[PDB]
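2.7 Reproducibility. Because tokenized structures are sensitive to small changes in the input, we list the exact sequence used for Galectin-3, including any N-terminal residues retained from the expression construct. No trimming or masking was applied before prediction.
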Amino acid sequence: PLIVPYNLPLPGGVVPRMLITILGTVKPNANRIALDFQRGNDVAFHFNPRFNENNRRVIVCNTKLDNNWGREERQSVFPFESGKPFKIQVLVEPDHFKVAVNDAHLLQYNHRVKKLNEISKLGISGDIDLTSASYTMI
Ligand SMILES: OC[C@H]1O[C@H](OC[C@H]2O[C@H](O[C@]3(CO[C@H]4O[C@H](CO)[C@H](O)[C@H](O)[C@H]4O)O[C@H](CO)[C@@H](O)[C@@H]3O)[C@H](O)[C@@H](O)[C@@H]2O)[C@H](O)[C@@H](O)[C@H]1O
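Resulting structure tokens (single pass, no recycling of outputs):
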């Protein structure tokens, strides 16, 4: 197991055709998960499953620039379940991050941060047991 919150360095940032794979298990009674693809203090891509926001489950995606969160992009398709193992695949494509969970496409998030090669860390946090976090070029 990896200790959460976990920092995965992304050496030289991200680039199209880079695939980031996160394996873990959601804790029982989880409230949140977060992936934070960071460009320094900025969060180029925040991917945030919320298990109980006003008694609904939703994935909130956003970008944080100069400590300001921007416009949220929300996805009510919610493939995570408390207690269950998951796989998150984040594929960097030219215009967006493409996220699949458990081998099913979930969402895309258009690049707001343009300096992809400066998005050099992925923070993984929240109510999970983290099994692995890695990347490969496909
Ligand atoms: O429920 C409606 C909401 O309306 C006002 O807030 C508007 C404000 O909401 C969001 O701003 C933040 C974002 O931080 C949270 O979400 C990001 C991802 O987007 C991260 O997950 C953070 O960890 C979360 O804490 O949410 C609070 C407000 O709820 C702000 O302090 C944060 O900036 C949204 O991202 C942003 O665009 C939008 O302007 C109202 O203030 C709220 O009380 C609430 O009624």
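The chain has one domain: 6-137.
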